Design an enzyme around this catalytic site. Sequence first.
Site, PDB file in Angstrom:
ATOM      1  N   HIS A  81       1.608   9.695  -8.801  1.00 41.78           N
ATOM      2  CA  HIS A  81       1.803   9.058 -10.106  1.00 41.78           C
ATOM      3  C   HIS A  81       1.685  10.051 -11.252  1.00 41.78           C
ATOM      4  O   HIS A  81       1.249   9.698 -12.350  1.00 41.78           O
ATOM      5  CB  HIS A  81       0.829   7.895 -10.306  1.00 41.78           C
ATOM      6  N   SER A 132       1.462  -2.762  -6.279  1.00 42.58           N
ATOM      7  CA  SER A 132       0.720  -1.717  -6.969  1.00 42.58           C
ATOM      8  C   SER A 132       0.899  -0.423  -6.192  1.00 42.58           C
ATOM      9  O   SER A 132       0.507  -0.343  -5.022  1.00 42.58           O
ATOM     10  CB  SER A 132      -0.760  -2.086  -7.087  1.00 42.58           C
ATOM     11  N   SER A 133       1.522   0.563  -6.830  1.00 40.19           N
ATOM     12  CA  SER A 133       1.699   1.908  -6.272  1.00 40.19           C
ATOM     13  C   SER A 133       2.485   1.750  -4.971  1.00 40.19           C
ATOM     14  O   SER A 133       3.535   1.091  -4.978  1.00 40.19           O
ATOM     15  CB  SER A 133       0.330   2.582  -6.162  1.00 40.19           C
ATOM     16  N   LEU A 134       2.026   2.302  -3.846  1.00 42.55           N
ATOM     17  CA  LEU A 134       2.767   2.141  -2.597  1.00 42.55           C
ATOM     18  C   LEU A 134       2.895   0.680  -2.181  1.00 42.55           C
ATOM     19  O   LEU A 134       3.806   0.338  -1.419  1.00 42.55           O
ATOM     20  CB  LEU A 134       2.093   2.944  -1.487  1.00 42.55           C
TER      21      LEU A 134
END
Lengths: 320, 316
Positions: free
Chosen positions: B201, B98-100
């Site tokens: 994002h 998730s994300s980074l």
Amino acid sequence: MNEPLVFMFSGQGSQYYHMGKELFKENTVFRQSMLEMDAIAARRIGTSIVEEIYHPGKRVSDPFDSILFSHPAIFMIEYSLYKVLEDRGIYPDYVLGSSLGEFAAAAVSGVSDAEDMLDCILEQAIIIQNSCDKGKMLAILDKPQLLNDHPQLFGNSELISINYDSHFVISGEEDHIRKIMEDLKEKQILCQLLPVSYAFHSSLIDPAESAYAEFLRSKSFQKPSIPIVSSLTGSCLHVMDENFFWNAVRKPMMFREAIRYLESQHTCKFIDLGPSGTLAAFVKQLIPGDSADRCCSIITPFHQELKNLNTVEYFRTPER
Amino acid sequence: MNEPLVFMFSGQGSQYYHMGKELFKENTVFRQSMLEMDAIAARRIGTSIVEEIYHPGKRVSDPFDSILFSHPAIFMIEYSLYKVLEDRGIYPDYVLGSSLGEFAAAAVSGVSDAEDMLDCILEQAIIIQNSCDKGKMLAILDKPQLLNDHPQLFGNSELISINYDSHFVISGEEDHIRKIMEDLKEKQILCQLLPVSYAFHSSLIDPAESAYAEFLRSKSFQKPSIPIVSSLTGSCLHVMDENFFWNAVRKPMMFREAIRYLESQHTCKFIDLGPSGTLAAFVKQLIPGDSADRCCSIITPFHQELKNLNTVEYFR
Ligand SMILES: [Zn+2]
């Protein structure tokens, strides 16, 4: 992006006599792999599988429906063709299994080696040949909506696969299927028998589930190392249940869902490694018409394997 | 005890000062891993990441929004905790990014080794700092239907993530986000700023794309070996494009689709390896209420990492 290679493997219904004969005669890798597996299969069937496939008195149009020979024959042709491509440096980013082709997909993936998968196929053919009544599968060259609007037209049969908008297959007992064919003719609905002698992917092969599950417990399988997309689930598998290789021939199929999953993340290149090019024809119906060049087959009754292998060379992924 | 283990990795917004300090002090494997990566990151940043993470003049409630430290810190914490689980013989059947956290999941699965992933993260923080304007990210603790019924409340912002039925995150310019907050309070809609100084994002970090893409083309990544489920795509992931590690920070996320995909195959157990237990809280909302004991977090501001590590050992 580099477009990923999908190796597709078909199952019961796609075999025919003399499939791959030009590869058997002109390609040493193919011929060697077929002869190697033939020795394993001859021990359990009692005679050469290869000699049955290439029997000079049997034609492509003669249905190759004997399970004891067609089960091993489909795997042997498919894995041998894999070996040809692997030897040329053409590797799959994914494998797609369909019906009996799940076995070849699993062997290419590393779930098992070719010799153990061949044994699992030989065992399944023998167990089915001993415990199950014969049966039939019928392809309906029409809309699957017919199943809803006129369900009595298809009584005493089970739907096993919808392959695209105008193609679906049903499975049932011999007289039941022959009666449906009679009824469909009077409705001007075109259909075609598959060259099989058992109602695969239906409950009419349930008498074999116990003995095969017993057999499958004596085996030990590895986790996939090449991504497998399975027509049993319509999705990629990484965790595999213990009855998968029974469900490969028992459960209905989700081929369109499998193809949708692959086209959702990237624009794939599809190579049909099963005889007849059945799955390449289905894929072409499921993707935009201009994208037909992303999809080819190799082994077809046109016996153009060598020309088709040269076509596949254009699918090779770049360097840089 | 046959339901698969999913290792989950959160990204920007879940870090906080003194993450996992009890593990950094008492766990040899965790500490060892943190200090090895600290040496590497020190040669590139100039100072110590670890000394910033455990800054004695900082409290949990002080936003850990310095990108040059928060970027590497999330990965270092997550990979180090993974090493603790591997050392205890607790292995993942899936990693979820998730994300980074996609960097950590990629490193765990074998897409790249930890040192190279850390290098790609540091370069991302430096490039984003040098090229992009600051921004803000806002969690809204209310129904995402608000964006449809009352789109005027969120103008000048981009939706980046819907996490469950009463939590979504928007991203935008500093003053634009501050105005949204003011208007949300006149509507009695509760919200919370994430501890970030950039509009991750969203299109606002686009000035960093060309430089980071150029940097990426000097790298070579391997095929995944352990299965990766990506919030970027909401599904299992096997063949990555060149821009994957930029999209890990640039594109909106589909966390709910990823959890849905995982439950569609089998009944998983979820271990949150990211700080704050953010992903574990989301999954509890997305699966039946009975299944709350299938979700565990480890690193939380309660500093109960050792007690939580005993709990999780009953998962395998
Ligand atoms: Zn997958």
